[PDB]
Design a protein around this ligand. Structure first.
Ligand SMILES: *[B@@]1([O])OC2=C(C([O])=O)[C]=[C][C]=C2[C][C]1[N]C(=O)[C][C]1[C][C][C]([N][C][C][N])[C][C]1
Length: 267
């Protein structure tokens, strides 16, 4: 009835904003979990970029790639929302810097370049996720078409549970070795776009790594995080939202509140 009470709370919250909220949370110290609509499908939006970064680091680890190799794209027509890659179009970027821009700034050019050259496209991204035991994740399209968030569309979706389980494996588990993992954790911690989402649901002095998504259609937006409370094992939180009408705007406050409720549920 802790879990029952939190379910009712998320249900009211999703009704209050005429939308749908999916949650999965884990306390890695007790093993307690909480889920609401945790097996239902929600658009990934840019949230997959967090996993794209992990896939890059795994290639470096397999010695298929060098973290400091220069990636040049001087002639490319860069995607909308390429703030970092545009700045370095002239000089190029290291792969590592390009991967962390994709994560930390949600950079679309970084994303597509990496998928084109190193990861084997949406199909390759999906393969990477299957390789770590994630059978829900699917990436079907490239940026920016993957953000359409059409009601009923299963392209470019996962479930709140699969996302949480995967971030657990990547950030805290053993897919990456201890050196490579440390880099990945530092990339998540440095994320710039999540101040009003999961980070807003915990104390400022806790350490948080996260990746957001904002589709910009159908009120669809999300966030996942690893949270290190002071003197406590880490928490994993995965929050996904959609809303009913195309023109609806996402709700950062709803995401933060759902995180608060999920965190209470496992405590
Ligand atoms: B994406 O899903 O992630 C992303 C975020 C985020 O992660 O929350 C912020 C800014 C851009 C992006 C890129 C990806 N999304 C898009 O390309 C569409 C997005 C949605 C509408 C816009 N909102 C900014 C002010 N309204 C920005 C583009």
């Amino acid at each position: 009835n802790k879990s029952d009470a939190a379910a009712k709370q998320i249900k009211k919250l999703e009704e209050d904003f005429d939308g749908r909220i999916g949650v999965f949370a884990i306390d890695t110290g007790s093993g307690n979990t909480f889920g609401y609509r945790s097996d239902e499908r929600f658009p990934l939006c840019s949230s997959f970029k967090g996993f794209l970064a992990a896939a890059v680091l795994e290639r470096v680890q397999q010695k298929k790639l060098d973290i400091n190799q220069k990636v040049k794209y001087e002639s490319r027509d860069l995607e909308y929302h390429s703030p970092i890659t545009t700045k370095y179009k002239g000089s190029g970027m290291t792969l590592g810097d390009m991967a962390s821009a994709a994560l930390q700034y949600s950079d679309n050019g970084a994303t597509n370049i990496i998928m084109e050259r190193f990861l084997g496209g949406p199909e390759g991204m999906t393969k990477f996720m299957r390789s770590i035991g994630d059978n829900e994740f699917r990436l079907d399209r490239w940026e920016l078409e993957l953000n359409t968030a059409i009601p009923g569309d299963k392209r470019d979706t996962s479930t709140p549970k699969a996302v949480a389980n995967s971030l657990n494996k990547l950030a805290l588990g053993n897919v990456l070795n201890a050196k490579v993992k440390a880099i990945y954790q530092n990339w998540l911690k440095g994320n710039t776009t999540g101040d009003a989402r999961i980070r807003a649901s915990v104390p400022a002095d806790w350490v948080v790594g996260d990746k957001t998504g904002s589709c910009g259609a159908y009120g669809t937006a999300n966030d996942y995080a690893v949270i290190w409370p002071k003197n406590r094992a880490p928490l994993i939180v995965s929050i996904y939202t959609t809303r009913k009408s195309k023109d609806d705007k996402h709700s950062d406050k709803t995401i933060a509140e759902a995180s608060r409720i999920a965190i209470q549920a496992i405590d």
